Every structure is written in structure tokens, then in C-alpha cells.
Amino acid sequence: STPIQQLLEHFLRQLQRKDPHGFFAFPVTDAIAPGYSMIIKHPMDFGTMKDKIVANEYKSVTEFKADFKLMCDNAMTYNRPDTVYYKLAKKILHAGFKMMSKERLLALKRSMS
């Protein structure tokens, strides 16, 4: 397991600790979410992000963050604002973007010299 993959698995673990109920752990199916696959044409979830890390498909933290943003944005698109899904997506988006902020990654870069 390479250096980049370790870093990504670390970010991924900290994000998933924000979702104790595993709402975002796996893909949303039309059977639990009517109309989901028509409303959300670019689905994403933490399981898929795990798989992509395992398959070494991420070239950068930017790419991992884009997937995480996608996941959150989907939940805020599909679900009404009074729902647990919308609220948790909104909270975790902002928290995960602080965690993986440009300035924090610069700090990390510094330390990796």
C-alpha cells in the first residue's frame, strides 16, 4: 500500500467517522430512493471511493476531494433540506473541505520534504 494510498485511506477514515450510520457507505438504489438514478446521473459514495483507492485510481488529493464533493452535492440535490441526509451531507462537506484545505495540504507537503 503506497504513500498516497495511506494518506487517502486516512482522509477517508476521518470522513467516514463523521457518518456513524453509514448513510454514505454504499450506493443509493432506486428501490430505497425513488427516481435517484434519473436525478443523480453521477452517483458516488464512500465504498466507491474506498474501491478507487484500493485500485490505485486516484492521482491526487484534488481528485479524491472532487469525489467527496460529488457525493455531498448529490445528497443535497436529491434530498429535501429537512432530511437527515441533506443535513449530514452539508455538515460533512464543510468539515471535509476544512480537513483537506489547500493550506493544510501545503503544510503536509512541507513536512514531506
Ligand SMILES: Cc1cc(=O)n(C)c2cc(N3CCCCC3=O)ccc12
Ligand atoms: C433515500 C436516501 C437518500 C440519500 O441521499 N442517501 C445517501 C441514502 C442512503 C441510503 N443508504 C445507502 C447505503 C448505505 C446505507 C444507507 O443508509 C439509503 C437511502 C438514502
